[PDB]
Amino acid sequence: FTPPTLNADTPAPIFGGSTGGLLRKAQVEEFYVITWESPKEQIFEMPTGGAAIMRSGPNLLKLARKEQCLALGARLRTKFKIQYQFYRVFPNGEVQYLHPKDGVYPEKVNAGRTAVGVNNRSIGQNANPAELKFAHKQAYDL
Amino acid sequence: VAGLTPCKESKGFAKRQKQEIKKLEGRLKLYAPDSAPALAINATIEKTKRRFEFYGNQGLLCGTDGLPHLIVDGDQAHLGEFVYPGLVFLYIAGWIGWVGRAYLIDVRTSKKPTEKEIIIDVPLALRIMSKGLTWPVAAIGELRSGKLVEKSSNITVSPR
Amino acid sequence: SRFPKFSRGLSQDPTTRRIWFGIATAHDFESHDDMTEERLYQKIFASHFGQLAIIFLWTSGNLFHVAWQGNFEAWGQDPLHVRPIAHAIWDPHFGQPAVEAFTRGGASGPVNIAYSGVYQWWYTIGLRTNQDLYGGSIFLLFVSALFLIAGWLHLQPKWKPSVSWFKNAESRLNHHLSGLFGVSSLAWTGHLVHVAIPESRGEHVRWNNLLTALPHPQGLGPFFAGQWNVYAQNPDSNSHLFGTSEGAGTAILTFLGGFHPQTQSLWLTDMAHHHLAIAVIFIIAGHMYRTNFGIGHSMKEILEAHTPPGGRLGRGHKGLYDTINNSLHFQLGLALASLGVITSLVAQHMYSLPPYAFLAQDFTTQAALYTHHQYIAGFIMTGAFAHGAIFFIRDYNPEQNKDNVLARMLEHKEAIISHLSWASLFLGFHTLGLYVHNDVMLAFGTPEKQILIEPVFAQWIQSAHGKALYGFDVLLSSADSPAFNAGQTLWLPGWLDAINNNSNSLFLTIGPGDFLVHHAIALGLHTTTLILVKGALDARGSKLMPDKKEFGYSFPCDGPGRGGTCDISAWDAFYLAVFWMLNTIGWVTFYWHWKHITLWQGNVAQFNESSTYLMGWLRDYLWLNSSQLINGYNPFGMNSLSVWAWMFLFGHLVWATGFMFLISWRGYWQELIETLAWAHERTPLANLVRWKDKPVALSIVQARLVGLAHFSVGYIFTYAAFLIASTSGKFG
Amino acid sequence: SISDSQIIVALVSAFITGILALRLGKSLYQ
Amino acid sequence: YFDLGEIDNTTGNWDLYGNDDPNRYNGFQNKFFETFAGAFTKRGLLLKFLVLGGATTIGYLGSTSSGDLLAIKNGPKQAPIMGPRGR
Amino acid sequence: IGPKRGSIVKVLRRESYWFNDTGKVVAVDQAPGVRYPVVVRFDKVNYAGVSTNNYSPDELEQS
Amino acid sequence: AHSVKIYDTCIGCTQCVRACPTDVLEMVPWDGCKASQIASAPRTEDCVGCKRCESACPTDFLSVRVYLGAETTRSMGLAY
Amino acid sequence: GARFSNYEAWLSDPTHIKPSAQVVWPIVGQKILNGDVGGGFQGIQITSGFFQLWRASGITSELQLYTTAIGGLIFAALMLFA
Ligand code: CLA
Ligand SMILES: CC1=C(/C=C/C(C)=C/C=C/C(C)=C/C=C/C=C(C)/C=C/C=C(C)/C=C/C2=C(C)CCCC2(C)C)C(C)(C)CCC1
Ligand code: SF4
Ligand code: SF4
Ligand code: SF4
């Protein structure tokens, strides 16, 4: 799956301004840009707090946290029939595409992704912490 | 016993009877003698005099405070302080514990066992509340037959 | 590698929590990163040396302040009418009433009156002048310096001891029982005999005349010839004044029992014999285990061989020697369990059998010294139980402990928790119902309708000790028992005179209020034991969450799912039982201070009539004794209790401030600090200032700890103030 | 009562003890 | 509002109240302050003499203060208050 | 595989809520590779409110 | 940061992914259930640690399990 | 106010008789709570201000209080019916 490229020419929803937006974490650490294609001019609830008029075409919204992108994204996936993707933008200029990684949402299964962080045992077959004293490994990562 | 005089010969216990009627007699001085609130204080005085003559006649032990103290060791003089009303209590408390245990067995073998605890089946309840009268013969009878206790293989146990 | 350097996972935290948790994970050495066995035991060994140095540098400054700013000689001339001075006060915030009001004990300036019983202790032991206390302070400065040198030395790689030396339990027990408990109590006996007994008898024995001042008229002749009774030949009479030669005897090791009749305190000849006895028996008990010489015991085979053959204990104690020896938290929990049971045995035996001269007469000092060891013992016992929980998470191996007694505690842990729950519920309904019933009967004008239960079991034990007040007359109160006739020529002439006296605190006359508050005490110990046994045995897991061991010891929660898992951890059971030890020891020291505050001014009938119901506790104890507490400073003026009136209010701040952390929880404050971060990042002239730590709210475990510590500081300061202001302002 | 020069002896011996406390805290760091 | 040519203008890196004026004083005022505050520049040097100078200046007037200046050096000026039980 | 459909089993899984509890088997998966094929229904819910859980045949015995 | 572990008791009910608010979990193919899918946590560095997946897991005991470990600016949920 | 009060006694002179409108039953020692409120009456001294409210309403007798009580019961039945 070829990841989508951030166009940086699509415009923003009509928003009057909020104080819940980008603080200095955007300036020095990261900020998140969510891009989605709209059928028409609607009104959505801003995850920073407030309401904005979303455009009739593609939209770009700048968010500070990854949880704000899913809270917006699941809002416009259930109330609206809008497919969305978001990115992670760093202050040096690198845009890191984040979701969906295979192009299909993680609720649906894809053959391309692999199992990572999966234990072949259960919780009751995890080892006791007394027999794993003074090691980098712990009771669940082995 | 335990350095306590009997309350019938205690000078402090008779002092508390004297200063309790005198408190109630001074309350009676500001009422008419045939008035309705004066009949309540006159009934209070006769309730007080009945109380002090009952405590001294039961062999109660009074300390230096003039107050009746209970000996709960199991003394042959002092059975009605703890042993006699304790056996009266445990019979009644075991009655509560036996008819609540027998109700849960009677509703566990039902179609909807959780609707019979918010809505208690009174014909099922009242037919075993009578049966809780003879409960030491039915608790130790279930203890000897093994029906009182459950084996630990059928008991939900949290893991180590 | 930022602060904290011992944990790599906290160094990458960009928030304030990195600053916080590095303070609180500082001594949890086994949870550190890149961390081994040898570094664990050597860092613990040097931390022990630093602890010893802190204790000795503490005692040095508590000796230096008595020798420098305290009137120890003036208290030695008259210990009944001179207040013992702790240290001078240099406060720039005093006005002239505060300087003129804190000047006590005949001092030249504002001083603090010592309620720690160090004057009574140092007087009884032999220290008389300020120069002796100064020499002791310099000597313990040298001892703490030597312990710092030894702590630095054992971290050097030439003198690093291996873990096999650290886990040598047999040699440690032999040299602890022989050396720490035996040669130190025999050293003591050599002090008490050489110095403290002749300083009680007026002879000035110091280091310059140690080899010339003979402690007995015939010294070390009758010791080696077998006739030890020469050392009990001429005891101190009842006309003996303490510190003076008149009325004194020559015997160094007596067995009189009871009290010195002028000080109402134990005899130094008895405490010398006591230490020669707990010195012979500890040096003999220190030759028990096998170290290097063929004879002795292996404790592994003692624990292996102690299996009942009926299988009621399973495998018995098989595998427990490696379980204790490998787990530092098992040894620390055992040490704190024993230490709490003996810090409470300290508290119970220094008020009833005062060991130091003129300590029984100084009332608020005795009150402080009971409350001290009962709070330090209710935090040491809870630390023992918390360390049992930490052992069950990070140190208990179920494979090594297979069907032994320790595994069988986990096998029937619901029976233990449910029966502690039944006992706590029994004590709570019964104690609350009887106190509320007695409250209703005093409210309804009828004191005679109370359920008052004479505590005839403990009164029978007091009559078994020799109290003729109750007239049980079984043994040691009747002359027909063999125990009395075996004791009436040996120790009982002192003991019966001490226990039949009604002015002392030796086995006080107890009543129905004592019965009721002893069930309050049993409620407190049973419910604290309930929460702590529940934390220790549900430490690895439970039916709500079976993998509590894999989340560590002090994890916050497990989420709102499965009903809700707040305070599920074993640290949270320790947290909830710190409130229960505070309530327990609050009840204990309320009972102590009110049983004694009515004894000391004479009217024990106030306690005998008022302790049976809680309005007597509120009115005649909490309200009546606080009369001169909160009047320590007024609009009209301020008294000498004013610092105790501020420290009382101060406690009501900090305790209530703990409620802010114990009621309000994290995410309110996290959104509040989010708004504060926006406000700082948008304010002109203040946006220029940055934070490097991201401001976050206090985390959930940290919130419970901060509220618990505030609760504890307020609780110990409200009672330290009330207790040291309602006995020292109204002496008696 | 203790003298003026004895306070100087105590303050040096506490400063020597404070150095040895500083030396252990450096070794506990390493 | 995302540009990919100016990353600072699309993230909030704005000098909201700054000014680009080079100078507004004169040379006589500027040379006086840098001469006097020239030994106060280095952070490691300034932290040394502020701790050492600050410890001396609180110990001087803590000790040379009089009775009217501070009440703790005035001492008691009346008879001491005797406590209960003759203590 | 499995003991029987519609049978009474007792759970031997330590970390389940229904350990040493009577349960009714409603479905056993006969597909190979399934770790926990036996679906057991219980009369009582857990703290999550569900009564349906999947166990292996090694974690159940017939009672 | 946080370590999210999936165990073999999972039935592939997908509701741990649907409850995830920071897109940590995804459904990969598997052969141990009727649904023939198990969860996995590739973006476990983005995990706040909220345990919404553990609240939505119907398996007793839980198949998804979140262990709160080292916490960074992802797992603290900050915007400043 | 109609049956268990001293409202006529309080209304005769209210500067010495305390307002009381609750009589307890003499059962378990709680009859001491029926205190000397004045006017030859024993009961709990009320602090709800109903006596001064009825004095401001012009209520002179306890028959008017009983009529207002049964009228309020009629209105309570009307609110239940509505
Ligand atoms: C005879 C030899 C000898 C003696 C004197 C000691 C002495 C000591 N060892 Mg040691 N040990 C020895 C050999 C020796 N050991 C051997 C051979 C082993 C090798 C296996 C060890 C290995 C060992 C370990 C690994 C540790 C110790 C530690 C300690 C100290 C115990 C803690 C402490 O000071 O509490 C003092 C305790 C007492 C004095 C006992 C008091 C008993 C109760 C609690 C009080 C009763 C007293 C009384 C009522 C109070 C009245 C006083 C009051 C008026 C103020 C102590 C200095 C620990 C330590 O602190 O390291 C620096 C430590 O980490 N040792
Ligand atoms: C969980 C845990 C733990 C802990 C626990 C604890 C903390 C406990 C406690 C406990 C305790 C803390 C106990 C105590 C006890 C004691 C006792 C038991 C005592 C007794 C005594 C006796 C018996 C004696 C006798 C006598 C008398 C009585 C009188 C006369 C005299 C004589 C001496 C004869 C540990 C760490 C191990 C670890 C593991 C887990
Ligand atoms: S975060 Fe707080 S409220 Fe939420 S589950 Fe944990 S303890 Fe409970
Ligand atoms: S803890 Fe929260 S963010 Fe992390 S995997 Fe679970 S649901 Fe997703
Ligand atoms: S919610 Fe639980 S059972 Fe469902 S897919 Fe996720 S891990 Fe598996």
The H-assigned helical ranges of C556-626 are 570-599, 604-610, 614-616
Chain B nearest-CA residue for F45 = B114
Q: Report whether residue C116 contacts ligand 1, using a CB cutoff of 6 Å.
A: no
Q: Name the pairing type of β-strands F38-41 and F22-28.
A: antiparallel
- Show binding-site residues of B for chlorophyll a: 73, 76
List Cα–Cα distances, E75 to C74, E58, E71, H37, in angstroms: 21, 20, 7, 59
Chain E residue numbers touching A36 (CB-CB < 8 A): none
Tokens of A116: 């990572």
**Ligand 2 centroid, distance to B73 Cα (angstroms):** 26
Distance of alpha carbon F18 from alpha carbon F42, whole angstroms: 8
**Rounded CA gap, C58 and C489, in Å?**
44
Q: What is the resolution of this structure in A?
A: 2.8
C441 annotated as a binding-site residue: no
Q: Closest approach of chain A CAs to the CA of F12, in angstroms?
A: 11
Contacts of H39 (CB under 8 A, 6+ apart): H6, H9, H10, H12, H17
Identify the residue among B23, B41, B47, B51 best suited for mutation to test binding to H, counting H beta carbons within 10 A and taking the highest: B41
Measured in angstroms, the CA of H26 and the nearest CA of chain C are apart by: 11
Task: Determine the distance separating the centroid of ligand 3 and the alpha carbon of C543, expressed in angstroms.
Answer: 18
Segment (H or E) for A63: strand A58-63
Q: Quick one: which of C585, C605, C599, C517 has its CA closest to C351? A: C599
Residues 6+ apart with CB under 8 A from C146: none
Please, are residues F48 and F17 in contact by the beta-carbon 8 Å criterion? no
Q: Does C561 sit within 8 Å of G54, measured CB to CB?
A: yes
Nearest C-alpha in G relative to A88: G46
Going from the Cα of C383 to the center of ligand 2, the distance in angstroms, rounded, reads: 15
The answer, for C207 touching chain E at a CB cutoff of 8 Å, is no
Cβ of C145 closer than 6 Å to ligand 1, yes or no, is no
Structure tokens at C455: 């505590």
3-state DSSP call for residue F50? coil
Ligand 2 is surrounded, with C-beta below 6 A, by C 330, 333-334, 337, 341, 384-385, 387-388, 391, 536
Q: How far, in Å, CA of D4 to CA of C719, rounded?
A: 39
Closest CA to C90 of C72, C63, C68, C71: C68
How many Å apart are CA A133 and CA C152, to the nearest integer?
27
Tell me which chain F residue has its CA closest to the CA of residue C564. Answer: F47
Verify whether ligand 1 is closer than 6 Å to residue C175 (CB atom): yes
- Specify the pairing of strand B68-70 against strand C452-453: parallel
Partner residues linked to A84 by β-bridges:
A36
How far is the CA of A11 from the CAs of A14, A43, A53, in angstroms? Answer: 9, 16, 12
C613, C442 in Cβ contact below 8 A?
Answer: yes
Chain C nearest-CA distance from E15, in A, is: 11
Nearest Cα residue to C510 out of C471, C455, C460, C473: C455
Whose structure tokens read 């595989």? Answer: F1
Nearest CA residue ID for atom 13, ligand 1 = C175
How far is it, in rounded angstroms, from Cα H51 to Cα H59?
Answer: 9
Question: Are the C-beta atoms of A137 and C559 separated by less than 8 Å?
Answer: no
Name the residue among C588, C540, C287 with its Cα closest to residue C389.
C540
Within an 8 Å CB–CB cutoff, is residue G69 touching chain C?
yes
Kindly list the residues from chain A whose CB atom is less than 8 angstroms away from the CB atom of residue C682.
19
According to DSSP, residue C617 is labeled I
Residues 6+ positions from C704 with CB-CB distance below 8 Å = C567, C572, C575, C661, C662
Separation in Å, CA B95 to CA B86, B125, C373: 14, 13, 46
The total number of structural domains in chain F stands at 1
Question: How is residue E35 written in tokens?
Answer: 């001469």
Q: Which domain, by its residues, includes F63? A: 1-63
What distance in Å separates the CA atoms of residue C654 and residue C707, rounded to the nearest whole number?
9
Q: How far is CA C648 from CA C376, C548, C625, C630, C717, in A?
A: 20, 40, 13, 8, 6
Pocket test for ligand 1, best of C122, C153, C180 (most atoms within 8 A of CB): C180
Q: Enumerate the domain spans of chain B.
A: 1-160
Structural domain of G66: 1-80
> Contact at 8 Å (CB) between B69 and C453?
yes
Closest CA to G41 of G74, G69, G16, G78: G16
DSSP calls for C334-378 = HHHHHHHHHHHHHHHTSSSS--STT-SS-HHHHHHHHHHHHHHHH
Please judge whether F53 and G59 are an interchain contact, meaning their C-beta atoms are less than 8 angstroms apart.
Answer: yes
Query: DSSP per residue over H29-81, as a string?
Result: SGGGGSEE-SSS-EEEE--S-HHHHHHHTT--SHHHHHHHHHHHHHHHHHHHH
C550:A140 CB<8 A:
yes
Considering only CB atoms, C731 lies closest to which of E74, E75, E85, namely E85
Q: Does H27 touch chain C (CB under 8 A)?
A: no
